[PDB]
C-alpha cells in the first residue's frame, strides 16, 4: 500500500550501504530517468542523507511529476523545487492498485487557496468556499469538498491506470557521509610486485606473511623512519608485510 498523493509518505534512509544494480536490473521499472545525476554513476558516490517519497498517481499525470510542471496534482498536492536534487522512478501497476469493484481509497486535492511550498508533509481536510460569501457547517452552494477519490478499474486503459511512483532526493557532500556505494574487492597476489590499495593506502611493493602481533586495537603498523611496512588484510585477519621492490 502507498500513501495518497495529498498525503504522500516519506521514508528516511541513512547509515546503510545502498546497491543500485538490484535497482537498475529490475524489469518492471518503466520510467527511470535522472536529471542531476547519472543512473550509472550512483554506485561510487557518497550521499549525506537520502529520503524517499511514495505515492500512487494516474497514468495521465505522469508527465506533471517532472520539475517545473504546473497542474492540479503538481501544485496542489506536491511541489518540486526549482533546483531538484535526485530523481524519480515511475511504473505502471494495474494488477495491485486497481480494484475490480472500484478502488476509491486514493484521493487527490482539488481546491486550495494557493500553491503549496515545495517539500511539504502537511495536509488539511477543511471544506472550501467557492464564493466570496463566508461558508461553514455542511457543504452547500459554493461549498464543495476539495478532494476527489480516484476511479481505478481493470477495464481502464493506458493514461488512466494507477501508477506507483517513488521520489528519491539527497544532498551532495553537505554533511558527514552516511550512505555510500559498495567497493570492489579483487583477489590477493603474494610474492610479486603489485600496486596495493589496502583500505585506501595506495603504494607499491610485494606482500609477504609476517609474524607481528596486531591486536584488533591496532590496525596499521609502521617503522622507525615512519614508512609503511605492515598492513592488515580487511577480508581476513592475517597480517601482511611490505618490503620495497
Amino acid at each position, epitope marked *: 500500500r502507498f500513501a495518497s498523493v495529498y498525503a504522500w509518505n516519506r521514508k528516511r534512509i541513512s547509515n546503510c550501504v545502498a546497491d543500485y544494480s538490484v535497482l537498475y536490473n529490475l524489469a518492471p521499472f518503466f520510467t527511470f530517468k535522472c536529471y542531476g545525476v547519472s543512473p550509472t554513476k550512483l554506485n561510487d558516490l557518497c550521499f549525506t542523507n537520502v529520503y524517499a517519497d511514495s505515492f500512487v498517481i494516474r497514468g495521465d499525470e505522469v508527465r506533471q511529476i517532472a520539475p517545473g510542471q504546473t497542474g492540479n496534482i503538481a501544485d496542489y498536492n506536491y511541489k518540486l523545487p526549482d533546483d531538484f536534487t535526485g530523481c524519480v522512478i515511475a511504473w505502471n501497476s494495474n494488477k495491485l492498485d486497481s480494484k475490480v469493484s472500484g478502488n476509491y481509497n486514493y484521493l487527490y486535492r*482539488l481546491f486550495r487557496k494557493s500553491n503549496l511550498k515545495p517539500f511539504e508533509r502537511d495536509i488539511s481536510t477543511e471544506i472550501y468556499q*467557492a464564493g*466570496n460569501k463566508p461558508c461553514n457547517g455542511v457543504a452547500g452552494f459554493n461549498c*464543495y469538498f476539495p478532494l476527489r477519490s480516484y476511479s481505478f478499474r481493470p477495464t481502464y486503459g493506458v493514461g488512466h491506470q494507477p501508477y506507483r511512483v517513488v521520489v528519491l532526493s539527497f544532498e551532495l557532500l553537505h554533511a558527514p557521509a552516511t550512505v555510500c556505494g559498495p567497493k570492489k574487492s579483487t583477489n590477493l597476489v603474494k610474492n610479486k610486485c603489485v600496486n596495493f590499495n589496502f583500505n585506501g593506502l595506495k603504494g607499491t611493493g610485494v606482500l609477504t606473511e609476517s609474524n607481528k602481533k596486531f591486536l584488533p586495537f591496532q590496525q596499521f603498523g609502521r617503522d622507525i623512519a615512519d614508512t609503511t611496512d605492515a598492513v592488515r588484510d580487511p577480508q581476513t585477519l592475517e597480517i601482511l608485510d611490505i618490503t620495497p621492490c
Partner: antibody
Amino acid sequence: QMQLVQSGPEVKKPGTSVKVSCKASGFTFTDVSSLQWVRQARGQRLEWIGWTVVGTGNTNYAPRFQERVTITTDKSTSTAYMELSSLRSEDTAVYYCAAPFCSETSCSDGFDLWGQGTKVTVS
Amino acid sequence: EIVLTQSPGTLSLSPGDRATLSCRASQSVRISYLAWYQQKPGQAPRLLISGSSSRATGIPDRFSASGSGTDFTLTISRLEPEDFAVYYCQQYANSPWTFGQGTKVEV
C-alpha cells in the same frame, strides 16, 4: 462572449428516450462551475429539476425526479446531457439551463447565465 | 420542497411610481441565499438581485433588496414600461429547490 446555445423545439411520441442539452460558446465548465436545469410550462411557475457540479460530480435532483431523469456534465466537451424517459403530456414544456460566471477564480451566489430553452412536447 | 409565496399576486400601478414586492418561505429563516428574477412571456428569466445584497451585470439601480428574516422584499423606485414581467424568488439551500408562484405586474 459569454454566450450559450440550446437545442430547438421538438415534438415526440410517448415511450421514446429524449436527449436534452445546452452548450456554451466561449464559456467552459472548468472545475468550479455548476449548472441547474429548470422547466416552464404554458402559464405555469418555474419548476427546478436538478443542479449538478461539474468539478466534484455531485448530482442533486428534484424529489419527484429521482427515477427517470439523468443529468451528466462533461468538462472535456463542456456539455450537459439529459436522458429523459416516460414523457407523458405533463413534460410538454420549455427547458432552461442556468450557470454562474465562475471560471476557476471566483463567483457569486446566483445563476446569471440563462439559456433560451428547448420547447419539448410529447403527444 | 419549499413552499414560497409571493405577494401581491397582481399589481396595477401607474408608471414612475414606487412599488414593493415580498416573498416568504416555510423553511428556516434565510436571507443571503435567495434571489429575485424577472421573466417575460416567451423569454428566459434573468437574475436581477442575488445574495440579498449584490447585483448582476446591467441590473438597474432601481432594484433594492430588503428583509432581515425569511421575508425578502424587492423595492422598485419607478416602473419603467419594460419592467412589466413576472417575479420569482428562488433559493440556494441545496435542498430541493422550488420557484415562487410569480408576482405579476400590469399597467
